Structure formats: structure tokens, C-alpha cells
Amino acid sequence: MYNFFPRKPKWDKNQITYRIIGYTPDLAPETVDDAFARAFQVWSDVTPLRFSRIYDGEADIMINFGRWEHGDGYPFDGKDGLLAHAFAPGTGVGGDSHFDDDELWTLGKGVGYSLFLVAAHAFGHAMGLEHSQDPGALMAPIYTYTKNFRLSQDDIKGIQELYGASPD
Ligand SMILES: CC(C)C[C@H](NC(=O)[C@@H]1C[C@H](N)CN1C(=O)CC[C@@H](NS(=O)(=O)c1ccc(NC(=O)c2ccc(C(N)=O)cc2)cc1)C(=O)O)C(=O)N(C)[C@@H](CCC(=O)O)C(=O)NCCCCC(N)=O
Ligand SMILES: O=P([O-])(O)O
Ligand SMILES: [Ca+2]
Ligand SMILES: [Ca+2]
Ligand SMILES: [Ca+2]
Ligand SMILES: [Zn+2]
Ligand SMILES: [Zn+2]
Numbered sequence: 529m530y531n532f533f534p535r536k537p538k539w540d541k542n543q544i545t546y547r548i549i550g551y552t553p554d555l556a557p558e559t560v561d562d563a564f565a566r567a568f569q570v571w572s573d574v575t576p577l578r579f580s581r582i583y584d585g586e587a588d589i590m591i592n593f594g595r596w597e598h599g600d601g602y603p604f605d606g607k608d609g610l611l612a613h614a615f616a617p618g619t620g621v622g623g624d625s626h627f628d629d630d631e632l633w634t635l636g637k638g639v640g641y642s643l644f645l646v647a648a649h650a651f652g653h654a655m656g657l658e659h660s661q662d663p664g665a666l667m668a669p670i671y672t673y674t675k676n677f678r679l680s681q682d683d684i685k686g687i688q689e690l691y692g693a694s695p696d
Pocket of ligand 6: 598602613
């Protein structure tokens with residue numbers, strides 16, 4: 529079933545804040561923003577968690593792209609291997625999600641990697657979800673493309689364990 533980080537860390541608030549510092553050239557900026565939004569919404573759908581975008585100063589979830597050493601001491605590794613990473617909820621680095629720009633970022637294709645799926649996956653980590661044993665779960669330790677995506681019961685009960693279900 530579902531898993532969390534060792535000390536079960538979580539946001540002390542439902543109103544979360546995100547900022548996109550950098551883009552990938554692989555996708556249109558507008559299409560990146562829609563991918564990051566839609567990724568936030570798979571989790572917002574089933575919790576009282578609300579993600580609101582800001583365009584300057586420290587946010588909860590600082591989003592960027594980078595390659596190799598990108599100034600956090602967790603280097604990326606070129607094409608494939610690490611696609612991305614997120615930090616468990618916390619101040620500063622806590623919940624910050626980074627994507628390796630040595631990857632080919634795509635949407636709606638089996639070729640390269642869906643920014644939306646990896647982001648959804650990564651944002652799981654940023655809410656305090658670890659990997660899960662269900663091979664169909666979004667918090668699977670493996671990337672898998674599907675054209676038509678739905679949050680598994682495993683991922684819903686895990687996030688609702690921390691933050692409760694949809695009140696709306
Ligand atoms: C940069 C990392 C080292 C940070 C780490 N986070 C992780 O270790 C996470 C959790 C887990 N251990 C995997 N993680 C990774 O960062 C690995 C990267 C990535 N690995 S991946 O590239 O091989 C990978 C694997 C799987 C996917 N999956 C998908 O994209 C995907 C899955 C499923 C589906 C589908 N079809 O359903 C579609 C797509 C994508 C990428 C991933 O899993 O995101 C972490 O949170 N810490 C070390 C924390 C430790 C926290 C703790 O232990 O309590 C830390 O010390 N942070 C310092 C400060 C933060 C807290 C504070 N403010 O005080
Ligand atoms: O490259 P991974 O994320 O499938 O291990
Ligand atoms: Ca890589
Ligand atoms: Ca942060
Ligand atoms: Ca790229
Ligand atoms: Zn990083
Ligand atoms: Zn992961």
C-alpha cells in the first residue's frame with residue numbers, strides 16, 4: 529500500500545504556493561504551465577489542497593529545470609536515469625520539484641517523458657508521499673506512459689491519510 533517519508537512530514541496548511549523559475553525548450557511555455565497545473569489538480573481533486581501560482585519571491589514549491597549540478601547537491605545524470613526529484617514538505621528546499629533538462633519532455637506520446645505524469649509523480653513526493661508497491665499507482669518507483677490517466681485508490685487513500693478527502 530501507500531508510504532510516507534520517515535518522520536511522516538506534511539504541510540501545516542491547505543493553501544500551497546508554487547513558482548516556475550525556469551522552463552524547458554522542449555515544450556511551449558504555456559503548455560509547460562498547463563502541465564504543472566494539471567499535475568497539481570490530480571492531487572487537488574481528492575484533498576482540500578489548493579495550489580496557487582506566484583511569479584516572484586520564495587514560494588512553498590519552487591519548480592525549476594536543470595542538469596547535472598543545479599545548486600542543491602543532488603546532481604542529475606544526463607539522458608534517462610534521474611528524470612526529476614522533489615523534497616518532502618518543509619521550509620526552503622521542502623517540496624521544491626526539479627526536472628532534468630537532459631530529458632526529452634513531451635505530452636500525449638510514448639516517446640520521451642510526459643511532464644504532466646512526472647510532475648504529478650514528483651508532486652506526490654512534495655506532499656510527503658513515498659513510493660508504493662502497487663504497480664498501477666502514480667507513486668510507483670517507475671515511470672509508465674498511459675494516454676488516459678486516473679489517480680489509483682492507493683494514491684488517493686495515501687494523500688487523504690495526510691490531508692483528508694475533497695470537501696467540495
Ligand atoms: C532530492 C531528493 C534526494 C530529496 C528527497 N526525496 C526523495 O528521496 C524522493 C522520495 C523517494 N525516495 C524518491 N525521491 C527522489 O527524489 C528520487 C527521484 C525520482 N526518481 S526517478 O527519477 O527514478 C523517478 C521514479 C519514478 C517516476 N515515476 C513517474 O514519473 C510516474 C509514476 C507512475 C506513473 C503512472 N502511470 O501512474 C507515471 C509516472 C519518475 C521518476 C523520483 O522518484 O521522484 C528528500 O525528500 N530528502 C532527502 C529529505 C529527507 C526527508 C526525510 O527523510 O524525512 C531531506 O533530507 N531533505 C532536505 C530538506 C527537506 C526537508 C526540510 N525542509 O527540512
Ligand atoms: O528512470 P526511472 O524513473 O524509470 O527509474
Ligand atoms: Ca537524467
Ligand atoms: Ca520550498
Ligand atoms: Ca530537455
Ligand atoms: Zn534539484
Ligand atoms: Zn518517485
